[PDB]
Amino acid sequence: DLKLWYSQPAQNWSEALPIGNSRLGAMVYGGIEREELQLNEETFWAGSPYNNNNPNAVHVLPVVRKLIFEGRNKEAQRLIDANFLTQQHGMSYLTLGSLYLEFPEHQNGSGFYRDLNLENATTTTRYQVDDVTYTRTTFASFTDNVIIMHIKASKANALNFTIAYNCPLVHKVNVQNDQLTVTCQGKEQEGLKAALRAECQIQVKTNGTLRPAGNTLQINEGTEATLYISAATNYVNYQDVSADESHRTSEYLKRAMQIPYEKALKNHIAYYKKQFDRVRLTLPAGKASQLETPKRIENFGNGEDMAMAALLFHYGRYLLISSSQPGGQPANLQGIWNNSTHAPWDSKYTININTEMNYWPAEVTNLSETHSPLFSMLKDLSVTGAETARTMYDCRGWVAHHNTDLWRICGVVDFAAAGMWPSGGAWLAQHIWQHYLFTGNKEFLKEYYPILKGTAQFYMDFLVEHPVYKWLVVSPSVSPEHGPITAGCTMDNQIAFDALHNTLLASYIAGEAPSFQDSLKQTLEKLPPMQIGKHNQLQEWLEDIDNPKDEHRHISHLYGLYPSNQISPYSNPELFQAARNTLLQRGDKATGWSIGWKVNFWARMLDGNHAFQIIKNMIQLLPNDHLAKEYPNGRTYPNMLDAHPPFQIDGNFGYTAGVAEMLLQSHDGAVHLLPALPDAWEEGSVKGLVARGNFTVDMDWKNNVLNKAIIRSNIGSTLRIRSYVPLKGKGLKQVNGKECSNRLFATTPIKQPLVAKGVSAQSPKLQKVYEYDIETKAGKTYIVNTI
Ligand SMILES: OC[C@@H]1O[C@H](O)[C@@H](O)[C@H](O)[C@@H]1O
Ligand SMILES: C[As](C)(=O)[O-]
Ligand SMILES: [Ca+2]
């Protein structure tokens, strides 16, 4: 059960299958008389180097702030829209075009089968024409940095086809020396000129004959043919476009063709398997699980295909591996897969939930390497966003708002109502802190500390005293993406808290001046506390203005519940219950990404049954975008890709991290085994998850109860297990009272929440937990059993 298969070739982009090696991507249709591979390279975007800083903002910031405190929010907003933005609002990721293979004589094909196999990161297309069988194997090589397509007829000399290319961009195609060569111009956008070019080269190994035919390349009388597809651009970094794209493309191709095909395949599969075989979720199958995958998606609701949930979980891991690898660019709104020259929201990096969600799987699902391209981006933003901080706000450190792109802009995007939100940089930076919590790597933390610290330094210079309540607050900002431009947003308070407090914790490891550490504490102590309001809800703003029917897709004020660690049912039961009520008020549906966050939310609520209800709200078929009005509840394409709609990859990755959080939590402050297992999943296993403190964890269960767990300690120190059932095992002390000495999965104290006048704050219903301690040694493995 690790393949997606189909009995008809793709009729549209939502039916085609994604492959990629992080840099090159293809979407594969499977068409019989004509195959299409629509291509992408991760650095092919519109525009040039630029920024969207508006220096007018520094002159106007005090006046904007005065008005907000006077309740004149519209006037402040009109002032923001005129002085804080430019004419450029993030450049669009682009398509690289489509390669077509034309099989004119393959008229009446039968016995058709298409798949994508997650075991080995290859797609297969197979069919009969008369007595002859045809088989296509396609993959984007992790080892040879080219896309490869291998085609085999089962009869001698029976293979004849043409290779051609098209693209919506301005392009040239030339056939010389049996090599098809494409050059592709980048694109002008919002008045910014095009500095990028792409090149693509195709060659073919075959026992048949090769010859040109206009701007196509024709193969005749073959038995096997093997296409080698290379491409690259002139991008080096955000302010350097001087590389030679032709040389780059030639070099990849030359090198890839030195290896024979069977070995090149083996190698690819091996390299992929190192990252992919680390983790498996197993849930029981039925006969239903054998059906083709669009049917599995459609019928998931009826309960007879629990294993499908596991398949979608594995798909997220495949996608992250296939879209994000060390040395490259981070996964954008669409991963690396996009066929437009003006995509939805420019297939950019949206950093008020979206880009962060993409990387939730990285640590917990055992894909730590996939995280690197993001840290790499953070170095860039720590420079370009220091320019933003200085020019616009006259502040030290660095900042980013709610969107950035290949050129690493950090200013205010689109318009104030959604864009005036200076906490994007600070949230992204927390991915540094989490990488440390999960790996324990102190060397990493010291390298990246200046960057993390930079966000804390910005807040210390940007925060201002609220005239009435005296708390330090972030203004002007919004709770993404609704309500007015305002001051004391709960989300900004939670992110500022993490920025300051985790900079502090890191400072004891990195080394710092006592005076800078005392600033951090003095600043934390002045931040606003969280609040329970008149509907027993957690307040999104300072004032008690939450609307209990509002089902807005964003729930930005539960950042603290997830992905942060500020709402614990043990430390703060009353607040936890207010979060619960907030979640009931927002409801279970909305966009694909919204649904993905909610699986994590309900996992942190320790409510497996509700989490599984969210899962059922994602696994519903949207056949394609042409039929969205007719299928308005569909959130998964026949691709198994997530639908906002349209296609947005956030939800695939949010879902995967969600299933993990259902089975394992390590943030508060113990390693919690099966914290949110649905009654639906009566029996199964999971292998390979990671807990903070760098523990790898395997678990299996029967009758809705943990049976056995196997925990490897990758770096030693104390392990604290937490469970709903009592446990036994070698060297397992029970513990009551004193907290654990391991800081990595430890939680952190928040300010006492305030309760509104005449509210009697409800208390949550919690299962009794049993906690145990183990003293562990790096490299060793410990087994735990149930009583
Ligand atoms: O850039 C993508 C957009 O980002 C915003 O944060 C969100 O409101 C939209 O639903 C969408 O995901
Ligand atoms: C206005 As836009 C879709 O280029 O950010
Ligand atoms: Ca990438």
Residue numbers in the entry: 21 to 807
What does the primary publication say about this deposited structure?
Bacteroides ovatus strain ATCC 8483 contains two PULs, spanning locus tags bacova_03417-50 (large xylan PUL or PUL-XylL) and bacova_04385-94 (small xylan PUL or PUL-XylS), that are activated when the organism is grown on wheat arabinoxylan (WAX).
The crystal structure of the α-L-galactosidase, BACOVA_03438, displays a central (α/α)6-helical barrel domain flanked by β-sandwich domains at the N- and C-termini, respectively. In the structure of the protein-product complex, β-L-Gal (GH95s are inverting enzymes), which adopts a 1C4 geometry typical of L-monosaccharides, is buried in the central cavity of the helical barrel domain. No carboxylic acid residue was found at the appropriate position for a general base catalyst, similar to the Bifidobacterium bifidum GH95 α-L-fucosidase, AfcA. The proposed catalytic asparagines in AfcA (Asn421 and Asn423) are structurally conserved in the GH95 α-L-galactosidase (Asn372 and Asn374), suggesting a similar role in BACOVA_03438. In AfcA His419 contributes to the hydrophobic sheath in which the C6 methyl group of the Fuc is housed, while in BACOVA_03438 the γO of Thr370 makes a direct polar contact with the O6 of L-Gal, the only part of the monosaccharide that differs from L-Fuc. The importance of the Thr370 in BACOVA_03438 is demonstrated by the complete loss of activity of the T370H mutant against CX. Significantly, the leaving group subsite (+1 subsite) is not conserved in the two enzymes (inferred in the case of BACOVA_03438), and it is possible that substrate binding in this region contributes to enzyme specificity.
